[PDB]
Amino acid sequence: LHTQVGRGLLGAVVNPLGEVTDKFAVTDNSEILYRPVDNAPPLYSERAAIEKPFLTGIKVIDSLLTCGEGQRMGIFASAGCGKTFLMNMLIEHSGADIYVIGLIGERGREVTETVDYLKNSEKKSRCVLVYATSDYSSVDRCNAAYIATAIAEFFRTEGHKVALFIDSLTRYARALRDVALAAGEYPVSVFDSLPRLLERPGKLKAGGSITAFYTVLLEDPLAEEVRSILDGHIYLSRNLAQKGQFPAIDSLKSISRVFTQVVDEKHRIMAAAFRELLSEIEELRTIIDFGEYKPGENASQDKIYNKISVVESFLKQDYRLGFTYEQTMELIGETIR
Numbered sequence: 001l002h003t004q005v006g007r008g009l010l011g012a013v014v015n016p017l018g019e020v021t022d023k024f025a026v027t028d029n030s031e032i033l034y035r036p037v038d039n040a041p042p043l044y045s046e047r048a049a050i051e052k053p054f055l056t057g058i059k060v061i062d063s064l065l066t067c068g069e070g071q072r073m074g075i076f077a078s079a080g081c082g083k084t085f086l087m088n089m090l091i092e093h094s095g096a097d098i099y100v101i102g103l104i105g106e107r108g109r110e111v112t113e114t115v116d117y118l119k120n121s122e123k124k125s126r127c128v129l130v131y132a133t134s135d136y137s138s139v140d141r142c143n144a145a146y147i148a149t150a151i152a153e154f155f156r157t158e159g160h161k162v163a164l165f166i167d168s169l170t171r172y173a174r175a176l177r178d179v180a181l182a183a184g185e186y187p188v189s190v191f192d193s194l195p196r197l198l199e200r201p202g203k204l205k206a207g208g209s210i211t212a213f214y215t216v217l218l219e220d221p222l223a224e225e226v227r228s229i230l231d232g233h234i235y236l237s238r239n240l241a242q243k244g245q246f247p248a249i250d251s252l253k254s255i256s257r258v259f260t261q262v263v264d265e266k267h268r269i270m271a272a273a274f275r276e277l278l279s280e281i282e283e284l285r286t287i288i289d290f291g292e293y294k295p296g297e298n299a300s301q302d303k304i305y306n307k308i309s310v311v312e313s314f315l316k317q318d319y320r321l322g323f324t325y326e327q328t329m330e331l332i333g334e335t336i337r
Contacts, residue, residue, distance in 0.1 A: 001038070003147045005154035006031040009128045010098070013115060016132045016140035018147055024115050025124035035154055037146035041199040048203040050231070053262040054163075054211045057093025057322030060315050063332045064251050064271050065234060068258040069161065070203030071211050074169075074227055077236035078218040081248045084113070085319050086236065087165055089247070090213060091123050093322030096163040097208075098155045099127045102148030105141050105171025108133040132175075138182075141175035142193065149200050152210050159208040164201055169194075169226055170217035194222075198229050232256040247317060251278055267329065273336045280304050281311060310335050 003018035009032070011025030018037075050068035067073055077083040091099050103111055111131045118124055128151055132144035145166060152164045166172065173194065180190035203209035214230065216223050227233050234254045241248035252275065260268060284304050287293050295302060314335045317323075323331070 001036060002034050003037045003150050004032055005035045005151050006033045008032040009151060011125055012128060014128065014130045014147065014151075016130075016136050016144045016147070018143075022115060024118040024121075024127070024129070027125050033154070035150055037143060037150045039150065039153060039200070041196065042202060042204060046204055046206065048205045048209075049261075050203060050258045051261055052203075053325075055095060055325055056090055057095075057324075058089055058247065059317055059323050059328045059331065060247065060249050060251055061234070062323070062325060062328045063267075064274065065232070065249075065254050065256045066259050066263050066267075067211060067256060068231070068262045069211055070201065070209045071232065071256070071258055072198060072201050072230045073211075073213050073256070074230045074233035075213055075215040075236070076218055076223065076227075076233055077215070077248075078238055081236035081238055081241045082246060083167070083215055083236060084110075086234075086247050086249075087167060087213065087215070088117060088121075089317075089319050089322075090165075091127070091163070092121065092320075094163060096211070097126065097160040098152075098162045099123055099165070100148050100152040100155070100162060101127065101129045101165045101167070102145055103129070103131040103167055104144055105132060105134060105168070105175060108135065138175040138178035141172060142179060145172050145197055149197065152212075153200065156204060156208040156210050161208055162210045164210050164212040166212065166214045168215040168217050170215070170220070170223075172197075173222065194226070195229060198226070231258055245312065245315060246319070249315075251275065251315070252282070270329065270332055270336060274332055277304070277307060277311060277336055281308055284308075307335075 007029040010027050011023055012020045013022035015021050050070050052069045054067040054069045056062055056067060075083060103114060111133055118127055130144050130148040132141040152162045155162045176190055176193055201210040201212035216226055232255050235250045236248045237250040281304060284301060314331055
């Protein structure tokens with residue numbers, strides 16, 4: 001019902017009981033406070049409008065799927081489309097003050113993977129990790145989500161720009177379902193914990209912000225209405241991963257619902273122009289695989305064909321590399337020209 005919060009948790013690993021069990025970094029700060037894990041979402045009047053971009057350093061995201069400070073973004077993928085590696089990129093190449101990661105229902109190898117990743121990360125001293133493995137109860141998995149959010153909420157009230165990661169909402173949802181049948185399942189369900197959890201992030205007028213990334217596993221009914229609640233979603237295409245396209249983000253099947261609110265007109269024009277070229281390329285891919293593309297016949301098709309490699313090159317991104325907003329807009333500029 002209460003968890004540890006504060007700068008003293010920076011660099012630490014926290015189990016579903018709110019106790020530190022490991023560290024991936026050590027900091028000079030030792031601030032430890034206590035707050036409840038279940039807190040009310042901000043009043044609408046307390047919430048600031050999402051107007052400022054949350055840069056990720058990932059070209060396809062920053063250019064076509066631009067995130068906003070205080071936004072909730074879904075990450076939809078089937079294991080493995082490189083979901084974990086996308087999250088790692090989001091941590092490395094963004095510029096948040098503090099990163100809070102909640103790993104829900106992960107095998108435990110997996111938990112150690114994230115820890116070993118953080119142990120060599122440059123963001124190590126700005127991260128807090130909360131985990132719940134497959135060996136913990138369904139109640140403990142749910143609390144892992146609340147603890148991570150509550151930890152993030154404290155940093156937000158201090159005015160920090162916080163990025164919250166929940167991997168995954170899928171395993172969290174199962175745990176919630178198992179908990180629901182406990183006590184045999186007015187006016188409180190166990191099923192409604194999911195919206196309460198998701199409306200907690202955001203930018204506060206009086207405080208910092210929480211930009212949250214919720215991962216959803218694909219193999220689902222409420223995968224479709226976690227989508228309904230959030231402010232956008234990123235889809236990792238299995239097709240794109242197998243073609244060696246990394247990150248395997250399907251731009252055309254993804255959206256940031258705050259896109260036009262966080263980029264200027266010049267950006268908006270380039271993005272729209274890029275998406276059309278993308279659509280034209282997909283049309284040609286079909287025509288090619290149908291065996292109806294002969295060079296020389298249609299000048300427009302030939303012009304589109306010769307744009308495929310530069311477009312693919314723009315979408316491609318080494319996971320170790322991060323791009324500034326000026327670089328991304330510069331690159332997409334030569335792609336559509």
